[PDB]
Enzyme design. Structure first.
Site, short mmCIF file in Angstrom:
data_model
loop_
_atom_site.label_atom_id
_atom_site.label_comp_id
_atom_site.label_asym_id
_atom_site.label_seq_id
_atom_site.Cartn_x
_atom_site.Cartn_y
_atom_site.Cartn_z
CB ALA A 30 -1.03 0.12 1.12
N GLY A 32 3.64 1.84 -2.01
CA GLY A 32 4.13 2.02 -3.58
C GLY A 32 4.22 0.94 -4.30
CB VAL A 34 8.76 -2.43 -6.30
CG1 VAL A 34 10.29 -2.83 -6.45
CG2 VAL A 34 8.47 -1.70 -4.91
CE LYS A 49 9.45 2.33 -1.22
NZ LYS A 49 10.12 1.73 0.05
CG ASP A 164 11.17 -3.93 3.98
OD1 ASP A 164 11.73 -2.90 3.07
OD2 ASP A 164 10.43 -4.61 3.83
MG LIG Z 1 9.32 -6.49 4.50
#
Ligand SMILES: [Mg+2]
Ligand SMILES: Nc1cccc(Oc2ccccn2)c1
Ligand SMILES: [Cl-]
Ligand SMILES: [Cl-]
Ligand SMILES: [Cl-]
Ligand SMILES: [Cl-]
Ligand SMILES: [Cl-]
Length: 348
Positions: A30, A32, A34, A49, A164
């Site tokens: 939600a 973006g 890639v 991204k 992340d």
């Molecule tokens: Mg992840």
């Protein structure tokens, strides 16, 4: 300014510099969309991204600025860094879109834990690299907040990168029921009973290390309460002094309602593991966060004797996070983000 070219791939307009070629869609949360691409300037395969609705609310504009500041800072062999950032806009007045470029990652830990045979030597090298990256992250007073096997990239030579970072993203629905999104989180922040601090990440490394040794999830709870019962059966219930650190009377009466249990014998849980691995797990998986081993202390543990080099375990430049307590308008967050896009200098 480079020359840009435009194309539509899977219902989306992509406007990118000519250096990026052979764009191919790979995924979309939600946050973006890639694409995989070939970067002709550097010769690397990259992930591009395109953020979705980066300035749609004050919360979203601030989260956009937060993610760009954090990625521009991280310069370490065991942490994802930023290869490029761009916008096709020629001024602030026409600025709408932000694109982020990183190294394209293949396998994550999950792929290698699920389907590979790991020697004790592989477990030493994988956990060493996670702690080397976390020493660097914590030295900048950054908390990752979301370490788990899907956020660890690993290559054919067992080399690892953290990615992340938690952007204060995860929702209530996302943390509900039998889900890997909660199995690696610290007990004291499971139901937000204590404020976050960099010590919660050290709990997540213990959960990962246990699963590499056994091939099985350490605390696969069916919901927050089932998961707390699995944790307290291994590490023991709290005593009076520790219980008092939780401000919420309701949580303490809740804590106080469970039968007391002792800490288990970890040599009888992790049957056959290297005794030095068992010793390090007992120092990470401590219920009281003040008493856990730190990343810098863990690097010097005898389990990592073949890899530890105190002259090659670097710390970060200082990171100013004063913006987090600042109240601004959407267009002020958008102008700060624009300045950070135009000031980007690429790595060597
Ligand atoms: Mg992840
Ligand atoms: N890290 C820490 C901080 C305060 C209290 C504490 O004990 C407990 C006990 C049960 C559930 C949650 N936290 C642990
Ligand atoms: Cl170009
Ligand atoms: Cl990188
Ligand atoms: Cl734009
Ligand atoms: Cl995961
Ligand atoms: Cl800074």
């Amino acid at each position: 300014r480079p020359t840009f070219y435009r194309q539509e791939l899977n219902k989306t307009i992509w406007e990118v510099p000519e250096r990026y070629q052979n764009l191919s869609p790979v995924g979309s949360g939600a946050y973006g969309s890639v694409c995989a691409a070939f970067d002709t300037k550097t010769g690397h395969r990259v992930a591009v991204k395109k953020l979705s609705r980066p300035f749609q609310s004050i919360i979203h504009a601030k989260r956009t600025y937060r993610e760009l500041r954090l990625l521009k800072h991280m310069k370490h062999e065991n942490v994802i860094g930023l290869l490029d950032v761009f916008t096709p806009a020629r001024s602030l007045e026409e600025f709408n879109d932000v694109y982020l470029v990183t190294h394209l990652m293949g396998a994550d830990l999950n792929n290698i834990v699920k389907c590979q045979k790991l020697t004790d030597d592989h477990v030493q090298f994988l956990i060493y690299q996670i702690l080397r990256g976390l020493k660097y992250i914590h030295s900048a007073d950054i908390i990752h907040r979301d370490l788990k096997p899907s956020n660890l990239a690993v290559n054919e030579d067992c080399e690892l990168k953290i990615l992340d970072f938690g952007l204060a993203r995860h929702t209530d629905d996302e943390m509900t029921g039998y889900v890997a999104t909660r199995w690696y989180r610290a007990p004291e922040i499971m139901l937000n009973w204590m404020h976050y601090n960099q010590t919660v990440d050290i709990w997540s490394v213990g959960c990962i290390m246990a699963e590499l040794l056994t091939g099985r999830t350490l605390f696969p709870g069916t919901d927050h309460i089932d998961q707390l019962k699995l944790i307290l059966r291994l590490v023991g219930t709290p005593g009076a002094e520790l219980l008092k650190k939780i401000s919420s009377e309701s949580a303490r009466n809740y804590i106080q309602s469970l039968a007391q249990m002792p800490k288990m014998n970890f040599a009888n849980v992790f049957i056959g593991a290297n005794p030095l691995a068992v010793d390090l797990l007992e120092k990470m998986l401590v219920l009281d966060s003040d008493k856990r081993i730190t990343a810098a202390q863990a690097l010097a543990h005898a389990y990592f004797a073949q890899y530890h080099d105190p002259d090659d375990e670097p710390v970060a430049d200082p990171y100013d996070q004063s913006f987090e307590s600042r109240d601004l308008l959407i267009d002020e967050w958008k102008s700060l983000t624009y300045d950070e896009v135009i000031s980007f200098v690429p790595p060597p």
